């Protein structure tokens, strides 16, 4: 339902460059030499650090982020277990001091180690191709 597509982002981008608020987040991109990137929903990936029903804390190479509302997502291969590498599609509820997402979906990506080895490059590649 997000009106913004699920933008791929690392925890540091929300933590450090996100602006605005609740109904309107914008990612500053001054360094690139581009204007603000509006976002509502995001695609994020990371290792499950801890999981307590409906909630979890994940960690990507740039930092941690938490996810809530997991009792409502589609039931695929179960992965709400410390150590699992997963992806989450979620609506941004907070960005600093720690990004927080309302989960739309959480998928297990532990099987193929390529996903984790490629995530940072994917985020860099996608952002390089956005006006």
């Amino acid at each position: 339902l997000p009106r913004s597509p699920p933008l791929k982002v690392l925890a540091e981008q929300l933590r450090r460059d996100a602006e605005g608020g609740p109904g309107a987040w914008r990612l500053s991109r001054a360094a690139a030499g581009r204007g603000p990137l509006d976002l509502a929903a995001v695609w994020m990936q990371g290792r499950v650090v801890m999981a307590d029903r409906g909630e979890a804390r994940l960690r990507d190479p740039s930092g941690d982020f938490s996810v809530r509302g997991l009792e409502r997502v589609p039931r695929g291969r179960p992965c709400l277990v410390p150590g699992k590498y997963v992806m989450v599609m979620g609506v941004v509820q907070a960005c600093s001091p720690e990004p927080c997402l309302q989960a739309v979906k959480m998928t297990d990506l532990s099987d193929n180690p390529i996903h984790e080895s490629m995530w940072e490059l994917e985020v860099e590649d996608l952002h390089r191709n956005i006006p």
Partner: protein, 150 residues
């Protein structure tokens, strides 16, 4: 008889490209590209009309949303039963049980799908058909690093 050479890498560059870029190029004819995407949600029932499996879903590669059609072969593979095989499975409780197990497996596979998909996009109709799925591999990782490291 014309190809906008200035977007060749935008549409074909290895390992995958982006939906937003494809749409921004305003394609005039059927265009086939490869994107890394997952399914946001199913948008309709699994149909068996025509004697084949088909279902529509909404996917995303992180830059846009796109409605796609899964038709025939990919679904037969995920479920493990073709339509006629399912119809035959009905006269035997245990074979039908296997079909139901295959139906649920297909349900979970689409929920967990996150791979490279080759899609045939028809601009004149506003959606695509999935032609193939492929797990990300080392080759893709190397291609991504190459278009970004040197």
């Amino acid at each position: 008889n014309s190809i906008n050479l200035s977007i060749a890498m935008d549409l074909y560059s290895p390992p995958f490209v982006y939906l937003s870029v494809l749409m921004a190029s305003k394609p005039k004819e059927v265009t086939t590209v490869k994107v890394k995407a997952f399914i946001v949600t199913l948008t309709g029932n699994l149909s068996s009309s025509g004697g084949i499996w088909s279902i529509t879903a909404k996917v995303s590669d992180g830059t846009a949303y796109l409605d796609v059609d899964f038709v025939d072969e990919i679904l037969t593979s995920l479920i493990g039963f073709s339509v006629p095989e399912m119809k035959q499975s009905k006269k035997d409780p245990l074979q039908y049980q296997k079909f139901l197990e295959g139906l649920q497996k297909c349900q979970r596979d689409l929920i967990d799908l996150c791979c490279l998909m080759t899609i045939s996009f028809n601009p004149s109709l506003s959606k695509a058909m999935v032609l193939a799925l492929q797990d990300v591999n080392m080759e893709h990782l190397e291609n991504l690093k190459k278009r970004l490291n040197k």
